[PDB]
Design a protein around this ligand. Structure first.
Ligand SMILES: Cc1cc2nc3c(=O)[nH]c(=O)nc-3n(C[C@H](O)[C@H](O)[C@H](O)COP(=O)(O)O)c2cc1C
Ligand SMILES: CCc1cc(O)n2nc(SCc3cc(Cl)ccc3Cl)nc2n1
Ligand SMILES: O=C(O)c1cc(=O)[nH]c(=O)[nH]1
Ligand SMILES: [Cl-]
Length: 353
């Protein structure tokens, strides 16, 4: 009632801004079971449900997001220099599909602003991480950058020391040429540079490095990414970003808007990409599963397919804050029904049957 009112009155971008403000001010029951704890990426996670990148692009609402019940928070994407992103309108709801299309184009306050914001709460975060509530930082590249690898390297040096993990986002559909960085040769060069930069940070400031990939890759592209990840010792994968596909059956009036599609229509394309990447990496590379999670069943499907952790965003825009607790409670119930001792036991379970 209260959320749909404000959202019917506001365009989606305005609603997003209000949600970030409300969350940041802490204007918002479930106590996490031991069954939901996961140890991965060199950290304890109190529960495996995180907020996906894009909700808190500029690191303004981190503490409010933990208050909402997320086991981990990812901020970004952050670009080196501030930039405005694409012209409006750039976000569209597809209510009949429980989906969103966005073409933000990496609107970002930039590394310096975000650095200072995170520094203001750096020791608070250190305590939260120790308590099982880690922080990830997702890095992008500026529109007019002439050297993509140097943009990512700048991000590692500036925000790496404030993050438990960093994400090399090479899968936004809304920056020209970006997804080409997922190609074997480009990815290997880029990731070598990123990992060199990371390894140069002092030990207590040295994050894990993950790569976030698209749902629209060819089988060759996926095989290539798996090979590079193993070759270089990349710490994990985030699977997946939004899709440039438009699955048959979309009903929303705005289905043919340009941008990345998220929410329910992405769900099974993302799950199958998790499944493939888990197999190609022999289950040895942690995966954060994302795309269309709005229930415990959705979360458990991704975990059984190979995800160690999951994230959501689009479900929050339809169902609000209560969806977080709902996913967690449902996931715990399913784990019990299916005879798992906890989340850890379920990771990759479909591959072992
Ligand atoms: C409005 C919006 C903005 C997004 N911005 C980013 C971003 O800056 N960086 C990123 O890696 N992913 C971004 N994403 C992608 C999401 O993190 C997530 O991969 C995708 O939306 C699928 O999850 P969902 O179906 O639960 O929303 C964005 C998604 C939405 C809906
Ligand atoms: C895709 C841009 C967008 C749009 C939107 O209504 N929301 N809503 C959220 S969180 C849900 C929420 C909505 C409102 Cl209006 C106020 C508080 C909260 Cl938590 N994030 C959003 N992001
Ligand atoms: O800024 C955006 O347009 C954005 C980035 C990204 O990685 N994914 C997405 O769907 N939108
Ligand atoms: Cl520091």
């Amino acid at each position: 009632h209260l959320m749909p009112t404000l959202q019917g009155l506001l365009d989606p971008e305005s609603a997003h801004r209000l949600a970030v403000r409300f969350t940041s001010l802490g204007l918002l029951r479930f106590q996490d079971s031991d069954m939901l704890e996961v140890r991965v990426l060199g950290h304890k996670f109190r529960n495996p449900v995180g907020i996906a990148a894009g909700f808190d692009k500029h690191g303004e609402a981190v503490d409010g997001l933990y208050k909402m019940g997320f086991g981990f928070v990812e901020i970004g994407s952050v670009t080196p220099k501030p930039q405005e992103g694409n012209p409006r309108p750039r976000v569209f709801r597809l209510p009949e599909d429980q989906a969103v299309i966005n073409r933000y184009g990496f609107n970002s306050h930039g590394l310096s602003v975000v650095e200072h914001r995170l520094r203001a709460r750096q020791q608070k975060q250190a305590k939260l991480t120790e308590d099982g509530l880690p922080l990830g930082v997702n890095l992008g590249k500026n529109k007019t950058s002439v050297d993509a690898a140097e943009d990512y390297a700048e991000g590692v040096r500036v925000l790496g020391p404030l993050a438990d993990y960093l994400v090399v986002n090479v899968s936004s559909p809304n920056t020209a040429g970006l997804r080409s960085l997922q190609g074997k040769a480009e990815l290997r060069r880029l990731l070598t540079k990123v990992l060199q930069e990371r390894d140069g940070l002092r030990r207590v400031h040295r994050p894990a490095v993950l790569v976030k990939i698209a749902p629209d890759l060819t089988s060759q592209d996926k095989e290539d990414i798996a090979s590079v990840v193993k070759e270089l010792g990349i710490d994990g994968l985030i699977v997946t970003n939004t899709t440039v596909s438009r699955p048959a059956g979309l009903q929303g009036a705005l289905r043919s808007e340009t941008g990345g599609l998220s929410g329910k229509p992405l769900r099974d394309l993302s799950t199958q990409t998790i499944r493939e990447m888990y197999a190609l990496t022999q289950g040895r590379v942690p995966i954060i599963g994302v795309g269309g999670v709005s229930s415990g069943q959705d979360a458990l499907e991704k975990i059984r397919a190979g995800a160690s952790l999951v994230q959501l965003y689009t479900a929050l825009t339809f169902w609000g804050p209560p969806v977080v607790g709902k996913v967690k409670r449902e996931l715990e119930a399913l784990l019990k029904e299916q005879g798992f001792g906890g989340v850890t036991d379920a990771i990759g379970a479909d591959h072992r049957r």
